Amino acid sequence: QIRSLCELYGYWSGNGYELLNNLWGKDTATSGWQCTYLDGTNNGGIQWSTAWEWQGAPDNVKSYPYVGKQIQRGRKISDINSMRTSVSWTYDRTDIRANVAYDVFTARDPDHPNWGGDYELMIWLARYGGIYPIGTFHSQVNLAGRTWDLWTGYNGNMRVYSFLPPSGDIRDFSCDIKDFFNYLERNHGYPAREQNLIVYQVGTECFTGGPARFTCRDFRADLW
Ligand SMILES: OC[C@H]1O[C@@H](O[C@H]2[C@H](O)[C@@H](O)[C@H](O[C@H]3[C@H](O)[C@@H](O)[C@H](O[C@H]4[C@H](O)[C@@H](O)[C@H](O)O[C@@H]4CO)O[C@@H]3CO)O[C@@H]2CO)[C@H](O)[C@@H](O)[C@@H]1O
């Protein structure tokens, strides 16, 4: 690896991207740790990985190490035409409580901190070990060439929309996240004209299990 980010909130940035050893829930663990590795910044993308083992509190996320596309504050979702992104990844085992997911926060306050927002949009590419997203099943949705189970609910005051694979995982994926926002704007009253983009990330929420290793063979993200 080029860089080893094994500290709590170990951080790298470059080429318009950032990487964080985001162990935000680790104090709920009874044992374990996690490191995030920058493997490469080849071909306009990021190659990275994270190794971990966690025990305790099986409904509590211990971490969400991520790669993020850096963005300028104050961009209304309605004024973003496209959020084209692709990811290729593997997990070395699936007998773990973990996901792989895109995470996007928006807020009416353009200076909202990066830990949350008024709304959260997740796109899950894996759902291992019997975990659930926030909330309850809403409906099925056709986007990005696939069918999704949309779940909705609240984390505090924040409305969370999670799009899940009905079956299996999706280890090679590409989409335009604006298709997902546009769907929410039309059918869920999502106030895109009032909401500013806060973060634009992909990573893995880790609950329990391991030793496990997530490898992101390639990540790219753009927005116009
Ligand atoms: O909290 C600040 C922290 O947030 C991090 O971002 C979180 C979002 O806050 C969060 O909404 C979301 O994590 C979800 C996860 O997707 C769900 O699978 C999980 O569901 C739990 C649920 O909470 C329980 O009630 C239920 O019984 O069990 C299920 C699991 O089976 O809930 C969590 C939130 O608790 O996604 C984001 C990534 O972790 C930020 O990354 C960080 O910066 C912030 O400090």
| Spatial separation of the C-alpha atoms in residues 31 and 60, rounded to whole Å | 13
Q: Which amino acid appears at position 48 of this protein?
A: W
Contact assessment for residue 123 and residue 100, using Cβ atoms and an 8 Å cutoff: no
- Which residue's CA lies nearest to atom 11 of ligand 1? 155
Binding site membership of 22 for ligand 1 (Cβ less than 6 Å): yes
Is 194 tagged catalytic? no
Torsion (CA) 162, 166, 171, 175 in degrees, nearest 10: -50
Q: Which residues pair with 153 in a beta bridge?
A: 160
With CA atoms as reference, report the closest residue to 89 among 55, 138, 35, 48.
Answer: 48
| Spatial separation of the C-alpha atoms in residues 38 and 138, rounded to whole Å | 37
Mutate to test the pocket of ligand 1, among 24, 61, 67 (most ligand atoms within 8 A of CB): 61
With CA atoms as reference, report the closest residue to 179 among 136, 210, 141.
Answer: 141
How many residues make up the chain in this entry?
Answer: 224
φ and ψ at 77, to 5 degrees?
Answer: -60, -35
Q: Which amino acid appears at position 111 of this protein?
A: D
- Which residue's CA lies nearest to atom 24 of ligand 1? 59
User: What CATH number does the domain located at 2-224 have?
Assistant: 2.60.120.180
Is 205 tagged catalytic? yes
The three state secondary structure string of the chain is CCEEECCCCCEEEECCEEEECCCCCHHHCCEEEEEEEEEECCCCCEEEEEEEEEECCCCCCCECCEEEECCCCCCEHHHCCCCEEEEEEEECCCCCEEEEEEEEEEECCCCCCCCCCCEEEEEEEEEECCCCCCCEEEEEEEECCEEEEEEEEEECCEEEEEEECCCCCCCEEEEEHHHHHHHHHHHHCCCCCCCEEEEEEEECCEEEEEEEEEEEEEEEECCC
With CA atoms as reference, report the closest residue to 8 among 63, 48, 51, 55.
Answer: 63
Domain ranges of the chain: 2-224
Contact assessment for residue 214 and residue 71, using Cβ atoms and an 8 Å cutoff: no
Q: Which residues pair with 118 in a beta bridge?
A: none
State the structure-solving technique: X-ray
- Among the listed residues 7, 18, 53, 120, the single catalytic one is 120
CA 170 to chain centre: 14
Number of other residues whose CB lies within 10 A of the CB of residue 13:
11
Binding site membership of 134 for ligand 1 (Cβ less than 6 Å): yes
Contact assessment for residue 98 and residue 206, using Cβ atoms and an 8 Å cutoff: yes
Q: How far away, in angstroms, is 43 Cα from ligand 1 center?
A: 32
- Give the angle subtended at the CA of 159 by the CAs of 95 and 115, to the nearest 5°: 70
Pairing verdict, β 97-107 and 136-143: unpaired
| Spatial separation of the C-alpha atoms in residues 117 and 156, rounded to whole Å | 10
Mutate to test the pocket of ligand 1, among 20, 64, 123, 125 (most ligand atoms within 8 A of CB): 64
- Which residue's CA lies nearest to atom 32 of ligand 1? 134
Number of other residues whose CB lies within 10 A of the CB of residue 74:
10
| Spatial separation of the C-alpha atoms in residues 96 and 116, rounded to whole Å | 26
Query: Which tokens sit at 6?
Result: 């094994």
> From the alpha carbon of 132, which atom of ligand 1 is closest?
31
| Spatial separation of the C-alpha atoms in residues 89 and 224, rounded to whole Å | 25
